[PDB]
Symmetry: D3
Subunit: 100 residues, 6 copies
């Protein structure tokens, strides 16, 4: 049983300021999403993330992460994540879930 989708995170002005969990990153910011599968799984599927859209300001470093936090049998938590003075205008993440 394979499912898929796409999280459109958009402009980072609408992204949440979050506390950093890496000593090396300041001004960490994420558009986190708690996605639920249309068809629940028995056990956590394997989930893969793919950044399939990007629009980043050139005067500053490209700093992005497609972050997978957790996968349960019913859904997962993932985020568009940036830090320091990176400016993203848009970012989208495609994903697949596969029954393991």
């Amino acid at each position: 049983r394979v499912q898929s989708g796409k999280i459109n995170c958009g402009d980072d002005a609408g992204w949440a300021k979050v506390p950093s969990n890496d000593p090396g990153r300041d001004n960490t910011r994420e558009l986190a999403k708690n996605i639920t599968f249309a068809s629940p799984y028995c056990r956590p599927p394997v989930v893969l993330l793919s950044i399939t859209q990007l629009d980043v300001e050139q005067s500053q470093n490209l700093r992005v992460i497609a972050r997978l936090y957790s996968v349960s049998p019913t859904g997962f938590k993932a985020s568009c994540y940036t830090w320091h003075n990176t400016k993203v205008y848009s970012m989208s993440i495609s994903w697949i879930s596969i029954e393991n």
Copy 2:
């Protein structure tokens, strides 16, 4: 039944100028490909796209999309897509298809 491949789009000088389908994007340009599976499927598989190569001009914003248009049981349509004054020297997209 899982299949995979890689679309190498190359330099955007050889990419097609296309009409925009987003009010926010001008000078939209794509190297679209109509890929056919070696082994046809019964029903549309799930297809995932992954940008696995990039070479972009730094003096301008990074603007890219790995665009999936449609998936049929026999193939799919996907593209390297850019817009405005982004300059890409190369871009490749890896993909997988999975019987659902």
Copy 3:
């Protein structure tokens, strides 16, 4: 049988200088990894690579490849790959393996 993981390549100062295999690329450099599956396969699975982290210097072109070299039934070889005067501070590649 689906397996997955993430190769964190880190700062390119710790990356290997390698001989180029493309006439168009000089100063080619890679953090290659020879990954072994926890559960060996019968036949080569299909493996997909996804760049899920990037931190690149803005004063120079973005040049990256998530390179898949080979897939055996027991593992695969993949690398973070860059060239010319691109500077990457970090890069991570997520992957999945699927019994075909």
Copy 4:
């Protein structure tokens, strides 16, 4: 995709007299059924037959076959088959179909 069912053939008085296709069998008789799957397949599934009910006259030899004739992607043909002076009061055949 796995499907299953059960063909109840009943008393052989309601069974068809058919021409023999084995030089060694006379008075051959079958309750043939042309079963269609609820969900069509892409390719012929593998089908297994299992006799799960029997009620046979003891004064004569037990002669039975659970006969699989053909499997298409949409269905299959199978039969309760007997010959000579065997008397069956009932016979049922369970089956499974599996996407190969």
Copy 5:
């Protein structure tokens, strides 16, 4: 996920006398078993029954059923079933369960 096993029912002297659920059968008798899968399923698997052993008295009619009552995600109920004056000395039923 495929599981399998074998229910050995043995001599019908140790079988339970049960009330008939078919107007046409008297003296109905079964060795019922409530089998639990080693690995629980998400949803009811498909279960197939196969009589793989038989030892029946010849002076009376062969009357047997390999009866599947119910399949849950955790197990199933099945029985060796006989009726009237059939005498079975042994009967075994093999089974498979398949994730659907």
Copy 6:
């Protein structure tokens, strides 16, 4: 990966006399077959046996077993098995193998 077939054992006059492995059975006799899969497996598949043909002498008890001895990744050993003064004129066993 599902495979299937049918072992036709024929008349028990051509069957081997074997030493009994059950204290309760004398004159044990089997047409054993060592079947190899067309496509080898990684691990032992699950194999199911189904008697799909029978022709037994009525003046003596019906005594039959569809015996599965062992399953390896490359094949399996199974037999038509009878004992005491049972007379079988023919017996066929259908089987399936399923990657577990």
